[PDB]
């Protein structure tokens, strides 16, 4: 076992466990009891003050439950370990696998184990709670991939050289396999990697279906193209523009603001003077593309804000610096939460594929709610960092 | 015996090296007799000069060792993290007997390597002679880990007998141990003695049936029966003179009841606390506070009881609006026969509306149920799908309500107004900023005293609303008020806003837009 330590001075996590539903508790008991028989985990005593939260998520196309341990806090307190392919995002098709099980073979430093402590809560506090800690490398922990890196490269060296037309990228418990082969040949080539993995020690995440990164779109800002223009129309037009101007300073409003001189009635239709007509058309051109000069700082946190546009439609933006969006997109349908989770997961997967990191989200929801339902629809094997917020009116309308 | 739990001092800390206060020779005398017994019983063992550690002791004749220091130097344990059950979560039992575990800490070995830190000293009576030193072999009463470690043990010790007797449930709590079954009186009283035996097996002495405790179980503000439950009988005072303090307590005492006594209202009482300058200040009761007191008094005069959980049946949660800001609910399984009830005053944010507030109540109940019954109940709400959905869809924040049924029980929640999704033709147009100017030439410039930048922004809008006709388009630069109103509140802590809200309810169509 490799000696792993927490960053210097840092102690272990003591995270509260969110109340789970009887159903999930059951799933977890079933699961954990077997992981014990197989000695992957071991009941711990009171001498262990640490604790990480566990959850039961659902497997897509499988009646089976998956245990999901929120090692977020742990990973943050875990020492760093001492390369992302820019080509991956370019492949036509990317398939994601769950090689999480690979870790269950490698033992965890007996001295670090205490920090993997987790607990199966009890209903109504009627029982103490089933406490356990990991003997092997735990899924979801930042160490595991690293420590398994080695045996991981060895396992892939054959397929990699046999199929160098294929890009294989691992992230935590996931393996990203991208290519450009025909879709049929893909799934076929994918399936082959599988048995080549079984040959050493893996389900299709995201439905066994493919991401198509190449087709990923950057939703630019858009302006209302319309027949006749009323005072209100323009007022909004000028507003939306006025805003966007902070990003693309080449935006001029002058001529439009001129049509809006004098307390006219909102509904009154205002014809556009050629001068303004062209000003708009220019503003239109400027927006056609993302503002130049926006580069990804590997050293900076990747942030992600989501907005609810109603009807099952959402808008998101990935940036590191304000107004300096690295990416933006939309998402269409379910209920508010289901969608919102699906989104985050979509936005994360991409974030990973592209930059190899997970973004920190800002969610348009009350925490108690998110805490309550999110697990009911979550399917990833990772959990991004998130915070909860209140979406400003204008900025929603502007997307 | 029991598997030992390994202990350590907090990183980079040494054992307590604290000096023993002088002790009345009469006190020296009683300690020796006491300590000698403990050594005769194995609990402690005299030690040598090897050990530099020491923890102060004193007599109360009983013994007490001050472990504060040792505690500050002792590692943190996964604690008893007390989170107690709520009666509504329990299931009915035929018999439930509790056993008081005889000195359990003294019955549990102590990690060898640690014992040395538990060292203390009994001063000798005469000057030239040294006093006897000791350390523990078992859980020291008053020591940091004793509880966690004691319970832990207990649990492992109860595992076997627990899986061997499925038809039995045991709830551990400090020294108490509760055993329940739907077993025959004797057949139950049987298993009990079966247990006591198994406990004795590891040396844990429990009370005799002649001396055990039987229901009702008055525990943590509750009164527990085999088939039912409630709150310890609460009695309202009958004073002429009410102090801020008496009031504050009463209100507290009233809230407590709310979880089972529906209809308890504290508004008028709580109102009494306004302005108060001291806990001893006498506040005379208002006429409506009297009525409230009197009303609750009567509500409390009826011994209502709670029912237990039938895992078999479903959970139904019903909610009502006990008045602006107040919501009442009751979770039942069997038709209008609760397990629990409760209120909700929780106003989240300065402004809000019934739809939102009710939705928030659903989330509390939801959260609360998962904690007590492990599942969410089907809800019966006084709002209709269309209404909800209409608010739902148009709100920037995401939200989701479990499975729910509309129950036509006034008052039904609704929206007293909605903003036009598009400017109104034929309606006058106002431009606000403190004043307004309209496309029709009208204008009013008013001077506000004590206002705040934002409160000025609303006044304008208010003004405009006032002066405008049944239909109005309003144009503002205030992004704030916009948000406020777009939110569509129907109650606010700000008087101003309520006025506006009233105006809004009255109009036929209002269109609000924002411009820089
Ligand atoms: C021991 C199992 C928990 C449990 C009870 O024990 C109680 C637990 C809380 C402390 C007091 C005793 C219980 C007590 C009564 Cl009086 C009636 C029904 C009950 N149903 C139950 O599931
Ligand atoms: Mg203006």
What structural keywords apply?
heterodimer, A: 399 residues, alpha+beta, HIV Type 1 Reverse Transcriptase, Chain A, domain 1, Alpha-Beta Plaits, 4 domains, five-stranded mixed beta sheet, three-stranded antiparallel beta sheet, B: 516 residues, 31% helix, binds 6-chloro-4-(cyclohexyloxy)-3-propylquinolin-2(1H)-one, binds magnesium ion, transferase, HIV-1 reverse transcriptase, aids, nnrti
Please compute the radius of gyration of chain A using only Cα atoms.
25 Å
Structural class label of chain B: alpha+beta
Strand order of the largest sheet of chain A: 11-10-9-12-13
* Span between termini of chain A: 51 Å
Number of strands of chain B: 23
Largest interface: A-B, 58 and 67 residues
H/E element sequence of chain A: HEEEHEEEHEEHHHHEEEHEHEH
Helix content of chain B: 25-40%
Strand order of the largest sheet of chain B: 14-13-12-16-17
Structural class of chain A: alpha+beta
Largest sheet of chain B: 5 strands, mixed
- Give the overall shape of chain B: elongated
Which ions, cofactors or small ligands are bound in this entry?
6-chloro-4-(cyclohexyloxy)-3-propylquinolin-2(1H)-one, magnesium ion
Percent range for β-strand residues of chain B: 15-25%
Q: What is the number of beta strands of chain A?
A: 13
> How far apart, in Å, are the first and last alpha carbons of chain B?
78 Å
PDB class: transferase
Keywords: HIV-1 reverse transcriptase, aids, nnrti, GW426318, drug design, transferase
Assembly: dimeric
Entry title: crystal structure of HIV-1 reverse transcriptase in complex with GW426318
